[PDB]
């Protein structure tokens, strides 16, 4: 179907073909001379004034090459930026998973794979997508026992069966509070929920 990446690859090919066609069309521009054909100039006009008309064509064609070279230097700078980004995505999404949030595509990024593409690389970013949600009352921390503070690790403290338990932030699964899913603090912050009988 119509796809953004396939369109991006075809845009690379089409932009190159359009630039090459535009450079070829610059050979048929008169540039203020009698004709754009050097044979037509030399088959109709004598050397002293033929040299003036050929000078008009040389100026036009050298100007077209200078403009094309300036555009090509700019485009290759953008390709260097893209290739540096693609090497960085290989290193930090494919060979490993760098702790950078939206670097390897949007969403909760799990892992990435790479495939070859015309003039580049195709990255397949795989993300953890929630399907259904549950509204739940959560606490971002608790004050327990001798006023010791605890904060949940990658999750929340929830009331389940009238007990304080933990759930992971990206999947609802009540499980017991332990040192595995908790950051300890020697003093609880104010507005941490008071749970004197926890642990």
């Amino acid at each position: 179907a119509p796809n953004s990446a396939l369109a991006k690859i075809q845009s690379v090919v089409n932009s190159n073909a359009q630039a090459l066609n535009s450079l070829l069309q610059q050979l048929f521009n008169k540039f203020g001379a009698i004709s754009s054909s050097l044979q037509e100039i030399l088959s109709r006009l004598d050397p002293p004034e033929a040299q003036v008309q050929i000078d008009r064509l040389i100026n036009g064609r050298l100007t077209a090459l200078n403009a094309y070279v300036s555009q090509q230097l700019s485009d290759i700078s953008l390709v260097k930026f893209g290739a540096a980004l693609a090497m960085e995505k290989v290193n930090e999404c494919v060979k490993s998973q760098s702790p950078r949030i939206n670097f390897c595509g949007n969403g909760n990024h799990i892992l990435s794979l790479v495939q070859n593409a015309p003039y580049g690389l195709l990255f397949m970013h795989f993300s953890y997508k929630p399907i259904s949600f549950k509204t739940v009352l959560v606490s971002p921390g608790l004050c327990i026992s001798g006023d010791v503070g605890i904060a949940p690790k990658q999750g929340y403290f929830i009331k389940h069966n009238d007990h304080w338990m933990f759930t992971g932030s990206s999947y609802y699964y009540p499980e017991p509070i332990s040192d595995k899913n908790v950051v300890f603090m020697n003093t609880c912050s104010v507005n941490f929920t008071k749970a004197p009988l926890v642990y």
Partner: protein, 48 residues
């Protein structure tokens, strides 16, 4: 100028491509700001 060839068509094409990159970039920035944002419907500017 018309006898000069497709010089203005090239200048328009380059500036339109440059302006298309600026428009595309502003969408990537706006997408990046909005990515993953969830707000409550009970939010109000006047009171909170």
């Amino acid at each position: 100028l018309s006898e000069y060839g497709t010089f203005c068509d090239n200048i328009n094409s380059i500036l339109d491509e440059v302006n298309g990159l600026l428009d595309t970039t502003q969408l990537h920035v706006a997408d990046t700001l909005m990515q993953g944002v969830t707000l409550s419907s009970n939010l109000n500017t006047n009171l909170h």
